[PDB]
Design a protein around this ligand. Structure first.
Ligand code: IRE
Length: 303
C-alpha cells in the first residue's frame, strides 16, 4: 500500500549558524544567505534560510511546515532537500544554498552564454527531478522556471513545495496550468507534465513570459480553442513537438516524465541537431571568513 515515511527531521539551534545577507524579501517572507555549523562537527555549510513573515499568524505557520514536511521527505540530486528547521518564533526553513539563484533569473541574465548543451541538460535534470517526485507519489503544482534553482550551471534542482500534494487527496499560477486544473481543480502528475512543457518553453525562450500581456481569466478560453505557445525561434520541430505533446487535452496522451528523460537525454547527445543557437559551440558558463572547512551540503549526510 503506502510505506512509512521515515525521513529524519532535524531541529537546529539558533546558535548553530550565522545569517549573512538578504536574498529575497517582500512576497510571503525573507530568504537569507547563511552559514551553518552543525555544532560538534566542525564543518561549515553554505545554506539558505526561508523565514516566514515576521507577522507570525497561525494561518501561515501551517503552510511553511507543510513545505518542511515535503522538503524533509525527498532525496534526489535534482530536488532541494531540507537540512533542518529552527524554532525561534517564526519557523526557519534551512536548506542548501543554491548560489547561482533561480533558473529563470539565470537564463534571462545570461542569454548569451547559454548553449544547447546547457538548455538540453536542464531539461533532462528537471525531468529527472520530477520523475522522482512521481515515484514518491507527489504532485508539485508549480513547476516553473522561477522554481528551479541552480547549484552550478550544470546542476539544477527543483524546489518550492508550498503547493505540493499526495496524488488524489484534498486540501494561482494560471499560465502554467493544465486544463483539468483551471476548469476542474484536477491534478495528476500528468498535469505537472503540462507545467514541465511550459517550463521548457520559458527556458527555450530565454526567460520569456508565457502568454505575455494576455490577461489570465482568458487563458481557459484561448487554451480551449486549441491554441498553445509558439515554437521558440531556437527550437527544431523535434523539441517543439515534445513541448506540444504536454499540452494535449487527454492527459494520458501527455508523455510521462520517464520518457521525457529519455527523449531529452537522447537529444542532449547531439545538442546542435535540436536547438539552433547563434555561435553556440563558442560558449561556456561567493566567500569571506575561513572556507577551509566549508563543504557543500550534497556531501553532508547523516544516516
Ligand atoms: C542565491 O539565490 C538563491 C539561492 C537559494 N538557495 C536555496 N534555496 C533558496 N530558496 C528557497 C526556496 C524554498 C525554501 F524552502 C528555502 Cl528554505 C529556500 C534560494 C533562493 C535564492 O534566491 C531566489 C531568487 C530571488 N529573486 C531575486 C530578485 O527578486 C525576485 C526573486
Amino acid at each position: 500500500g503506502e510505506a512509512p515515511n521515515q525521513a529524519l527531521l532535524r531541529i537546529l539551534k539558533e546558535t548553530e549558524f550565522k545569517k549573512i545577507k538578504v536574498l529575497s524579501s517582500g512576497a510571503f517572507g525573507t530568504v537569507y544567505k547563511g552559514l551553518w555549523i552543525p555544532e560538534g562537527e566542525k564543518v561549515k555549510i553554505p545554506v539558505a534560510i526561508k523565514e516566514l513573515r515576521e507577522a507570525t499568524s497561525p494561518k501561515a505557520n501551517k503552510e511553511i511546515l507543510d513545505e518542511a514536511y515535503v522538503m524533509a521527505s525527498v532525496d534526489n540530486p535534482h530536488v532541494c532537500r531540507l537540512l533542518g528547521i529552527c524554532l525561534t518564533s517564526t519557523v526557519q526553513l534551512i536548506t542548501q544554498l543554491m548560489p547561482f539563484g533561480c533558473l529563470l533569473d539565470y537564463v534571462r541574465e545570461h542569454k548569451d552564454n547559454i548553449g544547447s548543451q546547457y538548455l538540453l541538460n536542464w531539461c533532462v535534470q528537471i525531468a529527472k527531478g520530477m520523475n522522482y517526485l512521481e515515484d514518491r507519489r507527489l504532485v508539485h503544482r508549480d513547476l516553473a522556471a522561477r522554481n528551479v534553482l541552480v547549484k552550478t550551471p550544470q546542476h539544477v534542482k527543483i524546489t518550492d513545495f508550498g503547493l505540493a500534494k499526495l496524488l488524489g487527496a484534498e486540501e494561482v499560477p494560471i499560465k502554467w496550468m493544465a486544463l483539468e486544473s483551471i476548469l476542474h481543480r484536477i491534478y495528476t502528475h500528468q498535469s505537472d507534465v503540462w507545467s514541465y512543457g511550459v517550463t521548457v518553453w520559458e527556458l527555450m525562450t530565454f526567460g520569456s513570459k508565457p502568454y505575455d500581456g494576455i490577461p489570465a481569466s482568458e487563458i481557459s478560453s484561448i487554451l480551449e480553442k486549441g491554441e498553445r505557445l509558439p515554437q521558440p525561434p531556437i527550437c527544431t520541430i523535434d523539441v517543439y513537438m515534445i513541448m506540444v505533446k504536454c499540452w494535449m487535452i487527454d492527459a494520458d496522451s501527455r508523455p510521462k516524465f520517464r520518457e521525457l528523460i529519455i527523449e531529452f537525454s537522447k537529444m542532449a547527445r547531439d545538442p546542435q541537431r535540436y536547438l539552433v543557437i547563434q555561435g553556440d559551440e563558442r560558449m561556456h558558463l561567493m566567500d569571506e571568513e575561513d572556507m577551509d572547512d566549508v563543504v557543500d551540503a550534497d556531501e553532508y549526510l547523516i544516516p
